[PDB]
Amino acid sequence: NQYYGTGRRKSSAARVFIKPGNGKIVINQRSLEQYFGRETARMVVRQPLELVDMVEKLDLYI
Amino acid sequence: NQYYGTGRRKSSAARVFIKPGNGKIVINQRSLEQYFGRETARMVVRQPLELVDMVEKLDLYITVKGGGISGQAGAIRHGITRALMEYDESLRSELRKAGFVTRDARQVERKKVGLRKARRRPQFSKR
Amino acid sequence: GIEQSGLHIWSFGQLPESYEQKRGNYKVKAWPALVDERDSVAIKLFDNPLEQKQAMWNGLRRLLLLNIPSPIKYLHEKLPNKAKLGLYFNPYGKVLELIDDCISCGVDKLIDANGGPVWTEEGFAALHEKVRAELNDTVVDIAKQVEQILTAVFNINKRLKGRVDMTMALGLSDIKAQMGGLVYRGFVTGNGFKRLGDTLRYLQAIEKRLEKLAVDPHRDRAQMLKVENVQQAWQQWINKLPPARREDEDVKEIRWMIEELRVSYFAQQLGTPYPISDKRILQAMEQISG
Amino acid sequence: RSLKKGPFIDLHLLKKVEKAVESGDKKPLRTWSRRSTIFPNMIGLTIAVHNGRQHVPVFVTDEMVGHKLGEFAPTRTYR
């Protein structure tokens, strides 16, 4: 029950793996609070989930 | 491989199953002499079978639901006259000629406003 | 002819543990047992001692309830009528078959307390006199505990039926599944005397689920994800086993392990007989995968 | 015929009747509640029941107690 998505930008690549959960997110084996320090980056990582209100339905290994 | 028909009548509808046999009839898991044999309409259920040939040489499991006694009997009647459709137009023609393939169109109709019943108007007085 | 039919009284003496004959060079083995006929008892041959034991067990229950002078009508007469209305809480409706099942749950409890099924008429009489002297009054506990578990079923039914929301209905579907797993046709003889208290604990956990359910789906959602994952693990593990290993008892306690896990998630004021976590269910399953 | 559980009286009529009979018969008691039932403590007393315009006085004997106040006061006057 593991599903796959990929994301590419200028010189970047992200692999994301979906679990049903409660709303925990881990990037590169650290939390997003000790990761990205800029709040609009927090906005752009939450905004797909916040658009379709699955924001605490799942967990996601990124 | 089973003769089948469905007949309808006033507030009633019947499912009839017929197979080649030797004369038995079963209505709602009961016998015809038990279910109509003590009152009227015990003969309308059988009579198309005596008019058509092979009167003994079939046997039939029939059921009927809804309506009263004569409505149920007429439903059985129309169901049988349909259910012999596997026997072809060679006897369907004379069956319609006797006038039995037609579904009866009569139903009890509604009470109206300002009327005691169907058409009986309350008494008109004083002119 | 040891193998007969229409039998009603243990005149068999020392019933054969095994049957053996010889044909030419080689022997032929079998296992004779009793058979329930719902009217009487028979004796039939079998080819496996375990299913022989089950068949003789069933026929012994039928023979015992026939030889005891009316424990069925005795318990019908002496049973409390408020308890009988608690039995009338049955969605199935019939109460006489429920009392039949509870008397059977008395009978296997007393046979287990006396040391299991025996082959001899002396053991038959030794168990029979005691189940006469004690069966008529030990099943009052079974009857009142079925009354209590039916009051639990009553309360959980009055919670599940009615105005329901889909955020509730996620939990209520699993509650329905647990209800179907626990209560069924003859559930008291289905689970046995040793598990009747544990089922009351299970319905206490079912009760304690709903207060957290009505205030927060999400914590309930995550814990039901945990239960769901161990449940699908249970299905995919128990469905690959050999068919005897799909019906044995040692593979049968893992459902009760999952129910104790449900207790350990939702109602820890009640407790479990032993500490249990998902790691413990998995170490159990790869421990007994064989 | 009526409530079995308690033949009816008005509360103020009950307390007026008690404060009349315990103090003795001294004044004809005027009242409106025809719905009330006559009791044995009322026997020998004089009541003045409303018929719509005035009060008809009634004396209370033994067999009054099976009947109510309203039967002894016609309000429709047919000549």
Add this chain to the structure above:
Amino acid sequence: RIRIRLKAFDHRLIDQATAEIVETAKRTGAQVRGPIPLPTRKERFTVLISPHVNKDARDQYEIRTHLRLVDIVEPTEKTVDALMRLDLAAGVDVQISL
């Protein structure tokens, strides 16, 4: 196992409701039992049309409440999370019994 019931006054509108429900259910799940129709609550009224006289001058009306069932068999969290927040129909209401 999930008994989905719809009540409306407009049979057309409740067909577009049932079509949405059954199509989303087939889309993200399995084993629908179709849009089960039930006998309409056919509720009968008659009142007077004159304000004072004419007992025989009346008018007759009715309510046709249409019923539907769906009965999803597998209550999978995926398909119920899809079927929620997406029914959104104007003139129906919903029962979700177990």
Add this chain to the structure above:
RNA sequence: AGGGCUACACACGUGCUACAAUGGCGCAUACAAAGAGAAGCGACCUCGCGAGAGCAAGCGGACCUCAUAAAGUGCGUCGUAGUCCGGAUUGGAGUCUGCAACUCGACUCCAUGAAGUCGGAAUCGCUAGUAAUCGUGGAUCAGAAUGCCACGGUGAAUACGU
């Protein structure tokens, strides 16, 4: 707040029930449709002769309840008698609703047993599932229908003709 709208020498309207044997009564027995229900319909069990009462589920309802459809049929009986017809009226005693039933509810138990043996002048409705007859539900409504609106059962006769 009470009374009155419910009175009474009378006249008229529309209906209900009868004057019976094509029936009255007892036992047994078969077949419908449609509608209602949450301050609601209210199973089952128990009490009473019953109205109902105690307990009390199920049912926001193709599930549960109202709900036993009744005329119909097979037996036994009455026997043409105001008669086992009809039930008015009246007396006692109760059941429910509602703060409360006298004016001024409905219903049940017992007892009573009118008038009435098919009705003048005249006059009404009805052309087929119709007339006639037999029950059932609803709205109003706490309680209150022989009223009104629906539902089905059996089931006609006659129409030459203007």
